[PDB]
Each structure stands twice: as structure tokens, then as C-alpha cells.
Design an enzyme around this catalytic site. Structure first.
Site, short mmCIF file in Angstrom:
data_model
loop_
_atom_site.label_atom_id
_atom_site.label_comp_id
_atom_site.label_asym_id
_atom_site.label_seq_id
_atom_site.Cartn_x
_atom_site.Cartn_y
_atom_site.Cartn_z
N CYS A 31 0.83 -1.19 0.00
CA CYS A 31 0.00 0.00 0.00
C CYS A 31 0.87 1.24 0.00
O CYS A 31 1.68 1.44 0.91
CB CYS A 31 -0.92 0.02 1.21
SG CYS A 31 -1.92 1.53 1.26
N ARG B 190 -0.02 4.65 2.84
CA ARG B 190 0.06 4.45 4.29
C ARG B 190 0.49 5.69 5.08
O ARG B 190 0.49 5.64 6.31
CB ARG B 190 1.02 3.30 4.58
CG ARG B 190 0.48 1.95 4.19
CD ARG B 190 1.49 0.89 4.53
NE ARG B 190 2.49 0.74 3.47
CZ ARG B 190 3.68 0.16 3.67
NH1 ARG B 190 3.98 -0.30 4.87
NH2 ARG B 190 4.54 0.04 2.67
N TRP C 142 -9.27 6.38 -0.74
CA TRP C 142 -9.51 7.11 -1.97
C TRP C 142 -8.50 6.64 -3.03
O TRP C 142 -7.44 6.11 -2.72
CB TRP C 142 -9.44 8.61 -1.74
CG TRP C 142 -8.16 9.07 -1.11
CD1 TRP C 142 -6.96 9.27 -1.75
CD2 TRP C 142 -7.95 9.40 0.26
NE1 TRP C 142 -6.01 9.68 -0.84
CE2 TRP C 142 -6.60 9.78 0.40
CE3 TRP C 142 -8.77 9.41 1.39
CZ2 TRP C 142 -6.06 10.16 1.62
CZ3 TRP C 142 -8.23 9.78 2.59
CH2 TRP C 142 -6.88 10.15 2.70
N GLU D 2 -4.96 3.72 -10.69
CA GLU D 2 -5.73 2.50 -10.44
C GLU D 2 -6.91 2.39 -11.39
O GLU D 2 -7.27 1.28 -11.79
CB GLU D 2 -6.22 2.47 -8.99
CG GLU D 2 -5.14 2.33 -7.96
CD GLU D 2 -5.72 2.14 -6.56
OE1 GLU D 2 -5.99 0.97 -6.21
OE2 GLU D 2 -5.89 3.16 -5.83
C1 HEM Z 1 -6.19 6.34 2.17
C2 HEM Z 1 -5.88 6.30 0.87
C3 HEM Z 1 -5.27 5.04 0.22
C4 HEM Z 1 -4.62 5.05 -0.95
C5 HEM Z 1 -4.36 6.29 -1.82
C6 HEM Z 1 -4.20 3.69 -1.24
C7 HEM Z 1 -3.50 3.27 -2.34
C8 HEM Z 1 -3.30 1.94 -2.57
C9 HEM Z 1 -2.98 1.36 -3.83
C10 HEM Z 1 -2.80 2.16 -5.13
C11 HEM Z 1 -2.85 0.05 -3.66
C12 HEM Z 1 -2.51 -0.95 -4.78
C13 HEM Z 1 -3.66 -1.94 -4.86
C14 HEM Z 1 -3.98 -2.31 -6.27
O1 HEM Z 1 -3.17 -2.00 -7.20
O2 HEM Z 1 -5.06 -2.92 -6.45
C15 HEM Z 1 -3.11 -0.27 -2.27
C16 HEM Z 1 -3.07 -1.52 -1.68
C17 HEM Z 1 -3.43 -1.88 -0.41
N1 HEM Z 1 -3.89 -1.02 0.55
FE1 HEM Z 1 -3.98 1.02 0.30
N2 HEM Z 1 -4.63 2.88 -0.21
C18 HEM Z 1 -5.30 3.67 0.71
C19 HEM Z 1 -5.89 3.22 1.85
C20 HEM Z 1 -5.81 2.00 2.45
C21 HEM Z 1 -6.46 1.63 3.69
C22 HEM Z 1 -7.40 2.56 4.50
C23 HEM Z 1 -6.13 0.36 3.97
C24 HEM Z 1 -6.52 -0.54 5.16
C25 HEM Z 1 -6.97 -0.09 6.34
C26 HEM Z 1 -5.26 -0.08 2.91
C27 HEM Z 1 -4.67 -1.31 2.85
C28 HEM Z 1 -4.16 -1.77 1.68
C29 HEM Z 1 -3.83 -3.14 1.43
C30 HEM Z 1 -3.99 -4.30 2.44
C31 HEM Z 1 -3.40 -3.21 0.18
C32 HEM Z 1 -2.97 -4.51 -0.50
C33 HEM Z 1 -4.11 -4.83 -1.46
C34 HEM Z 1 -3.87 -6.19 -2.05
O3 HEM Z 1 -2.85 -6.82 -1.64
O4 HEM Z 1 -4.68 -6.62 -2.92
N3 HEM Z 1 -5.08 0.93 2.01
N4 HEM Z 1 -3.37 0.92 -1.63
C1 LIG Z 2 -8.19 0.91 0.34
C2 LIG Z 2 -7.69 0.98 -1.07
C3 LIG Z 2 -7.25 2.18 -1.62
C4 LIG Z 2 -6.78 2.22 -2.92
N1 LIG Z 2 -6.35 3.38 -3.46
N2 LIG Z 2 -6.76 1.09 -3.66
C5 LIG Z 2 -7.18 -0.10 -3.16
C6 LIG Z 2 -7.16 -1.34 -4.03
O1 LIG Z 2 -8.53 -1.59 -4.40
C7 LIG Z 2 -8.97 -2.05 -5.62
C8 LIG Z 2 -8.18 -2.86 -6.44
C9 LIG Z 2 -8.67 -3.31 -7.66
C10 LIG Z 2 -7.81 -4.18 -8.53
C11 LIG Z 2 -7.69 -5.50 -7.78
N3 LIG Z 2 -6.40 -6.19 -7.98
C12 LIG Z 2 -6.36 -6.69 -9.36
C13 LIG Z 2 -5.38 -7.84 -9.51
C14 LIG Z 2 -5.94 -8.96 -8.66
F1 LIG Z 2 -7.29 -8.95 -8.85
C15 LIG Z 2 -5.64 -8.52 -7.25
C16 LIG Z 2 -6.42 -7.24 -6.94
C17 LIG Z 2 -9.96 -2.96 -8.07
C18 LIG Z 2 -10.75 -2.16 -7.25
F2 LIG Z 2 -12.00 -1.80 -7.61
C19 LIG Z 2 -10.25 -1.71 -6.04
F3 LIG Z 2 -11.04 -0.94 -5.27
C20 LIG Z 2 -7.66 -0.16 -1.86
#
Ligand code: HEM
Ligand code: A1CN8
Ligand code: HEM
Ligand code: A1CN8
Ligand code: H4B
Ligand code: H4B
Ligand code: ZN
Lengths: 409, 414
Positions: free
Chosen positions: B110, B113, B282, B287
Site C-alpha cells: 500500500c 500508508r 480514496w 488505479e
Molecule cells: C487512504 C488512501 C489510500 C490510498 C491512496 C491507497 C492506495 C493503494 C494502492 C494504489 C494500492 C494498490 C492496490 C492495487 O493495485 O489494487 C493499495 C493496496 C493496499 N492497501 Fe492502500 N490505499 C489507501 C488506503 C488503504 C487503507 C485505508 C487500507 C486498510 C486499512 C489499505 C490497505 C491496503 C492493502 C492491504 C493493500 C494490499 C491490497 C492487495 O494486496 O490486494 N489501504 N493501496
Molecule cells: C483501500 C484501497 C485504496 C486504494 N487506493 N486502492 C485499493 C485497491 O482496491 C482495488 C483494487 C482493484 C484491482 C484488484 N487487484 C487486481 C489484480 C488482482 F485482482 C488482485 C487485486 C480494483 C478495485 F476496484 C479496487 F477498489 C484499496
């Protein structure tokens, strides 16, 4: 027996090649170092490494165990007992260099790994000889623009105090000049090396794209300067197929990427001087050399000419200007029929290379961090490709910069 | 032992001592790295839970400068008796807020963070049914959305007990668009979601069969069959995608939801598994503009965008894809900003993550980070994280992947 998946295709490859690794990757089960640029750091010591390569060589032609193999071992074994080392048969030398390249996990270009020209320079004894071998390498490899991959292999490390080294990081690089005002002119990554060359008597023309001299060290002696004949240094001036103000930017780049600071390890032998050259992926020049902030940093320059809103970063003015730069590079090399590959083709060919490798070899070590191009990452196929990374030998290792380790006479 | 990471752009070196506390496996071996593998890999016993609980409690009390206090000692003995008598235990609310916040703080994949401590935690552990779940999530959505001024949030449902009574949001994200395979092989809507869309339709969802249909929620309380609920459309904030220059971009009819809300992950705190814990933040622009619109397994609009950009699409080397990609992500960022829906571009978000990471090293001794995921999927090396060496290790409390409920659920009725 380990699976890797492509998330874009759902294709799945099984990896057995990794079981034949023995070098620590730096990671542990508790901590991955996949983004660390440099993760890890006699008789009964060198013969094992030699025995293994020869065993591996004769396997690539099924002579495994055959009397030549069993004799090559004793030949190598007794060379160590007298001469503290051994020498590679020509075939073994060519096999090892093609297989350090085959094993270069960071190299997206390895679909061509068997198409490698090997110039044996192991008889070389002076820096003047080193210059001659390299001059021939550059000319051969440049080939008027139709570039050819090639490596030149100098004598192996003998005792460390008699290393052959090319002190340039690459055969062809532009100079970098510290400025009166405190800024930088030319390639900033090279300022230190440029200052070494000046200290060593090079007369800097103090321009933006000054081809650096060859600084060559043979048999552990102090290094010596040589100016590559300019007719051997193919350069491409960078214009844009749309923006006719782009040539006004005064940009050019050389055509020959040639890595001269790495170490080539075959069967326990260390060739500390082994420059190898290929052709460029467009992004290398257009993204890393031209846009990295620690490099030529032309992003701001292009956007000014592009009218972009450099106010906020969410305008993506950096991204836009970035794309146009890399269009101008790819289009300038192809307009001059100098070999170049875009990141789409190169990544596509690497996917095919991976398939080939899993099929014929059972695996292919790859560094996702280096394979994925530095721009447009996810729109290329390697972004969605899982990659196992592990260290097979023969291999290209890094080595310390010589000036950090050289006692001057 | 320390551990150094270098930023190759700025030459700043940081020192990681925090890796020493990691426990779960990265998947790597001393001889193989799995750093780019997406998922490297019934319920805990008493003898397993004790040292997990004592570890988390030790860390919570160490966090509030109360390590060794009588509150700490009493709590440890309270947690101990619970596990001994009930085979599990219950977090206090402070411990749940702390646990959730530090699972986000420990999420190596993430990039956002820096915001980890401003997280609205909704304790939904009194929930017993799917209707109750739908009500907690609706509230989450309305709260997080905040009329576009998005606020990070997590709703936490009853922890796992025996493994047979799990709570689950079958939705991978709370708000996503349906996908429909056509007889001819083409896909309508979001192709990623086609399997899940079928599951809903089987469960009785009548599908609009449009390009941007919000999927129903499919909610599973206490090991029971899951049940369908339509999120109220007024609660789903959507943004029409338009381009600041290309007046034809609005004619592509693209739109996307404002709230990204992951709900298939498992929140692990003190050895407790919260199998349903939807959290939301957000978006980073890439993304939507890079993965959602331009991935070939997704909405896959580069072709059509380049067409209307009059791009030479003959050869790849024209970089028609790269050109059109940038313009899409300009449109997405410009659209969310025009409607004052919180969104962050990849430059801003990575610049902030470097600040976070550096601050985290100073105050905490490290910051586990997954470079493969941290680097935006466009313009990688012109963002500061690309030149930033990162250590990846798994700290607990953590967010974990978990099997898709439809691959594990044994159905009940008829
Ligand atoms: C607050 C604004 C946040 C932004 C801008 C942000 C941005 C991102 C982005 C761009 C990813 C990549 C995920 C993907 O490509 O699908 C990610 C992953 C992740 N975020 Fe954040 N995120 C936010 C909040 C959070 C929050 C609130 C949590 C949990 C309390 C969180 C936990 C995670 C986790 C666990 C992943 C790993 C997702 C996965 O492994 O599929 N994030 N975040
Ligand atoms: C809290 C938070 C903040 C942030 N800015 N982004 C996220 C990530 O949330 C998402 C991710 C995706 C892609 C899922 N990705 C694709 C490859 C495999 F499917 C593994 C997962 C679609 C979607 F609609 C999402 F909302 C979470
Ligand atoms: C023929 C076309 C080739 C292309 C397009 C190509 C492409 C690339 C690129 C883009 C990189 C990473 C760029 C960087 O980080 O500087 C790389 C790394 C590398 N390539 Fe190739 N390459 C080619 C040929 C070769 C050849 C001939 C060799 C000879 C052994 C080779 C061995 C390597 C090695 C060892 C690395 C890792 C270098 C490092 O760690 O810095 N490649 N390649
Ligand atoms: C065989 C081959 C083919 C190919 N197409 N490209 C290469 C790579 O050649 C180069 C790489 C760089 C970047 C080096 N960069 C900086 C930090 C460290 F020095 C290592 C990483 C600059 C340069 F001028 C180059 F020529 C090799
Ligand atoms: C194979 C590779 O691990 C996979 O495509 C990853 C790469 N990095 C990523 N990074 C982010 N932020 N999101 C992703 O879905 C992925 N996918
Ligand atoms: C910190 C990080 O490992 C470093 O910046 C790497 C990332 N990936 C790279 N990939 C390529 N091709 N070339 C590079 O120099 C780098 N640098
Ligand atoms: Zn690793």
C-alpha cells in the site's frame, strides 16, 4: 517444482531450473530484498566451481561422463595443483559467456542469448592491446548501424593485483562537468569518472555530449587513457516526428550500449574485464538517461516547449513530456537505421523467451524489478508475469569500482 | 543487526531495524526470490493462540507507553484466561482500533500508508446476520464517501471461531461493475467481474446488462449462505470521465465509482482472524486510468482512445499506447478533481509515500514495502519510489489474502 502465473493471460509455467541454483539471492524466508540493487555480498575452493561448470558444459552436448569430460576434470584439477588456476577451452569460453547472458535475470534482451559474438582477448597483456580489442569490438558490434551483440573477454583475475579492468562503466558514455555555479553539464552520473579522466590528463571539451575516453587497466598496472576513434562511435541526433522544435533541443545519444564494469564468472574463473554490448531498448535513453533527475533531466525542458501546465503534478505534464521524448528517441534511431527496440516489442519478445526457456530448460531466472520497463509498465506483458529470480552460474556479477581499490604506482 | 536501503536518486540511506520483529514468511528462500509472485504460500488452537495474543498485547501496551504496567499485566492475564476457557479471546475496542490501524500501517503493498493513523474503525462485532452486515456496510459507504471528501474507514465483523461460521463479503470490493460474457465471446461491462456477476445472477440478481452496473452485495454472516442486497444508488458516488482538452472524451461514456473499498481480505490481530473487514480509502489515479481502463483483461480502451486521438497504431514504436494512456489518466484525475471527489495522482502519492517511509524509518525503525506494488503501473521511474530500495517483510497485525468464499462455502438450502 514451482509455478509462476501470468495474470494477463492465465498462462502458468512450472519452474524446475531454480533447483539448480546455489548462490544466495539475499532474501530469506523472513525478508525479501527483491528491490535491493546489491542484495548479497585455492585447491578445495576453486576446483569445485570448475568441476561444476565443466560438468554443466558437457551436459549441453550430452558428453556427460565421456572420456573427454573425465579428462577435462583431471586436466583442470592438476592445472590448479601447479598453476593455481586453469584456462578455458575456446568452446567452454563461448559457452560460458553465452550462459552468463542466458542467466542475467535483469536483462530483458535475452531472447538473443545464443546470438552472441565472443571475442577472446585472453592473450592481451597491455592497455594498448586492450584498446585495440575494444576498438575492434565497438566496430564489429556497431556494424554501420545494424548492431550485433558481442563480448570481449580479457585475461582472468590472476591474483587481484594483476586485474584487467575497463574503468569506464560503459565503453561509450558522455562526460559530466561540475559547474562554477554549482550545477552540472553533460551526464551527471559520470562527474566522478570525468574528474578522474581530467586528473589523468584528458583535455575536456566541456560540452554537453563529450564522448569519454577509454581508461584501461591491464595486468594490474595504472590505467591509461585512449580516445576511441570518433568514426567508431555511432551517435544518433534526437528529433521528433511531429515537434519540429525537438531537434532544437540539441539532443543526441550514442548507438552502442556496452557494459564494461561487470565481472564474468565461469567455472570459478573471474574475468574482471569483459565488456559486452547489445542494442538499446528505447526507454533506457528516453526515460532513464534523459528524464531521471540525477541525469540529463530534460523533462522540464520539454514541457516548457510543449506548453504543458507545469503548475500541478496532476496535470501529468511529466508523463506527457516523457512519452514524447521516448517517441523522439525510437523515431530517431529508426530514421538512421540504427538498431533499437521499443519496450513493447522487447517485453513481448521476453515473454516468448520465458516460454521458450521453461519449455527447453525448465525455467528462466528473471528480476521483475528490472524487467518491467521504467515507463508504461502495466501496458507491457511482463508487468503481469510472475517471475522467479535465482542465481545460476556462469554469471555477470558486479564488482567494486577500480579507483576505490587500486594502489597507484 | 541493522539493514540499509539506499535511494539511488537522492543517495539517502536509511537503516532498518524493524525487520527483526517480522514473523510470517515472505515466500522467499535463501536461494529463490518470489518478490513478484502475487500469492506465495483449519483454525488456531489454544497452544497456538497464547503466544500470538501475548505478542500483540505486548506491542499494544508498548505502543501506549504502558509496557509492564499493571493494566498490561492484568490484560495479559485476562487474555490468557479467555483463550484457556473459550479457546479464543475478544479485543477491547482500543485494541481493535490499534490493530486495524497497524494492519494498514504494515501493508507493504500500500502506497497510501502516510494516512495510516487517520482511519475510522467501525466495530461491527455485534453483527449476527447478513441484513445486519448490509446495514453496517451502507453506513461505512455513506461515511467514507462523505459527498466526495472521502475518509478512510474499515468495518470489522465478528472474528472467525471454528472456521465453519465465518463472516464474509463475497464481493471483492464493495462497489464494482458487473461483467457479462456474451454468446459471441465479447464481454459487456467489467470483464474482471464476470465470474462474480454470474454468481449474483444465480442467486437471483436481475442484471441490467449495462456497461456500468453496480453489483449487488453478497453478504455472508456466521457461516450461512450469503444473501443479496442492492446498495442504495444514492450512496454510490460516481464520476463521469471527461478530458480537459478532448471534448470528445465525454462521448466515450466512461464513468467510475469514487470509493475503492476492498472487502475480500482478512484482518489478523493478535492471532484473531477477521474474515470480513471491508476497508476503503480514496483512489490513486493510475488505479482507474491504467489498470481499470487500460489493462487488456479489463475495460481495454486504449485502442478506442488512440483512434479518436488520430494515433498511428500501425507499429508499437509509435507509442500510441503510451500516448493514449497518459491522456486517459489526465482525464480521470481531472474528472475526480472537477467534482471534488478525493483522488491522488501517482506523483503526489509516491512523493508522499517517500516522506512516510523516511518518517517511518526514523520513528519506527523501518517500513516494510513491496516495490513491485508501490511503483505506479505507469511512468515508473519518474516517481521517487522507483529509485527507492525497499525491504519487504510481514509484520503483524496484517491484512492477508484469503480463499474466495465460493471456492470454500458448502451450501445449505433445498
Ligand atoms: C487512504 C488512501 C489510500 C490510498 C491512496 C491507497 C492506495 C493503494 C494502492 C494504489 C494500492 C494498490 C492496490 C492495487 O493495485 O489494487 C493499495 C493496496 C493496499 N492497501 Fe492502500 N490505499 C489507501 C488506503 C488503504 C487503507 C485505508 C487500507 C486498510 C486499512 C489499505 C490497505 C491496503 C492493502 C492491504 C493493500 C494490499 C491490497 C492487495 O494486496 O490486494 N489501504 N493501496
Ligand atoms: C483501500 C484501497 C485504496 C486504494 N487506493 N486502492 C485499493 C485497491 O482496491 C482495488 C483494487 C482493484 C484491482 C484488484 N487487484 C487486481 C489484480 C488482482 F485482482 C488482485 C487485486 C480494483 C478495485 F476496484 C479496487 F477498489 C484499496
Ligand atoms: C541485444 C539487445 C539487448 C537489450 C535490448 C538489452 C536490454 C537490457 C536492459 C533494458 C537492461 C536493464 C537496463 C539498465 O538497467 O541499464 C539490461 C540488463 C542487462 N543485460 Fe541486456 N540487453 C541486450 C543485450 C545484452 C547483452 C548482449 C548482454 C551480454 C551479456 C546482456 C546482459 C545484461 C546484463 C548482465 C544486464 C544486467 C546489468 C545490470 O545489472 O546493470 N544484455 N538489458
Ligand atoms: C548489454 C546491454 C544492453 C542494453 N540495451 N542496455 C544495457 C545497459 O547499459 C547502460 C545502462 C545504464 C544505466 C546504469 N544504471 C545506473 C546505476 C548502475 F550503474 C546500474 C544501472 C547507462 C548506460 F549508459 C548504459 F549503456 C546493457
Ligand atoms: C506479476 C505481478 O506481481 C503483478 O502483475 C502485480 C505487479 N504489481 C502490481 N502493483 C499494483 N499496485 N497492483 C497490481 O495489481 C500489481 N500486479
Ligand atoms: C531501487 C531499485 O531497485 C532500483 O532503482 C532499480 C529498479 N529497477 C530498475 N530497472 C532497470 N531496468 N534499471 C534500473 O536501473 C533499475 N533500478
Ligand atoms: Zn525476495
Amino acid at each position: 517444482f514451482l509455478k509462476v502465473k501470468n495474470w494477463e493471460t492465465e498462462v502458468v509455467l512450472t519452474d524446475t531450473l531454480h533447483l539448480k541454483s546455489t548462490l544466495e539471492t539475499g532474501c530469506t524466508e523472513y525478508i525479501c530484498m527483491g528491490s535491493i540493487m546489491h542484495p548479497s555480498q585455492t585447491k578445495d575452493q576453486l576446483f569445485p566451481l570448475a568441476k561444476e561448470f565443466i560438468d554443466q558444459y558437457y551436459s549441453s552436448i550430452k558428453r556427460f561422463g565421456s572420456k573427454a569430460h573425465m579428462e577435462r576434470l583431471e586436466e583442470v584439477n592438476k592445472e590448479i595443483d601447479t598453476t593455481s588456476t586453469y584456462q578455458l577451452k575456446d568452446t567452454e569460453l563461448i559457452y560460458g559467456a553465452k550462459h552468463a547472458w542466458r542467466n542475467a535475470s535483469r536483462c530483458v534482451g535475452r531472447i538473443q542469448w545464443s546470438k552472441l559474438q565472443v571475442f577472446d582477448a585472453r592473450d592481451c597483456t597491455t592497455a594498448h592491446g586492450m584498446f585495440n580489442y575494444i576498438c575492434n569490438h565497438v566496430k564489429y558490434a556497431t556494424n554501420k548501424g545494424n548492431l550485433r551483440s558481442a563480448i570481449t573477454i580479457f585475461p582472468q583475475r590472476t591474483d587481484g593485483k594483476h586485474d584487467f579492468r575497463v574503468w569506464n562503466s560503459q565503453l561509450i558514455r558522455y562526460a559530466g562537468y561540475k559547474q562554477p555555479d554549482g550545477s552540472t553539464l553533460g551526464d551527471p552520473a559520470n562527474v566522478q569518472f570525468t574528474e578522474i579522466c581530467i586528473q589523468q590528463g584528458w583535455k575536456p571539451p566541456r560540452g554537453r555530449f563529450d564522448v569519454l575516453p577509454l581508461l584501461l587497466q591491464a595486468n594490474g598496472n595504472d590505467p591509461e587513457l585512449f580516445q576511441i576513434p570518433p568514426e567508431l562511435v555511432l551517435e544518433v541526433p534526437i528529433r521528433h516526428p511531429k515537434f519540429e522544435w525537438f531537434k532544437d533541443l540539441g539532443l543526441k545519444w550514442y548507438g552502442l550500449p556496452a557494459v564494461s564494469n561487470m565481472l564474468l564468472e565461469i567455472g570459478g574463473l573471474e574475468f574482471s574485464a569483459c565488456p559486452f554490448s547489445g542494442w538499446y531498448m528505447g526507454t533506457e535513453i528516453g526515460v532513464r538517461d534523459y528524464c531521471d533527475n540525477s541525469r540529463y533531466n530534460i523533462l522540464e525542458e520539454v514541457a516548457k516547449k510543449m506548453n504543458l501546465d507545469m503548475r500541478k503534478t496532476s496535470s501529468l505534464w511529466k508523463d506527457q513530456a516523457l512519452v514524447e521524448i521516448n517517441i523522439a528517441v525510437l523515431y530517431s534511431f529508426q530514421s538512421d537505421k540504427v538498431t533499437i527496440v521499443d519496450h513493447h516489442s522487447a517485453t513481448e519478445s521476453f515473454i516468448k523467451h520465458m516460454e521458450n526457456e521453461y519449455r527447453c530448460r525448465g525455467g528462466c531466472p528473471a528480476d521483475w524489478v528490472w524487467i518491467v520497463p521504467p515507463m508504461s509498465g502495466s501496458i507491457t506483458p511482463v508487468f503481469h508475469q510472475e517471475m522467479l529470480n535465482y542465481r545460476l552460474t556462469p554469471s555477470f556479477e558486479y564488482q567494486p569500482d577500480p579507483w576505490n581499490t587500486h594502489v597507484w604506482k
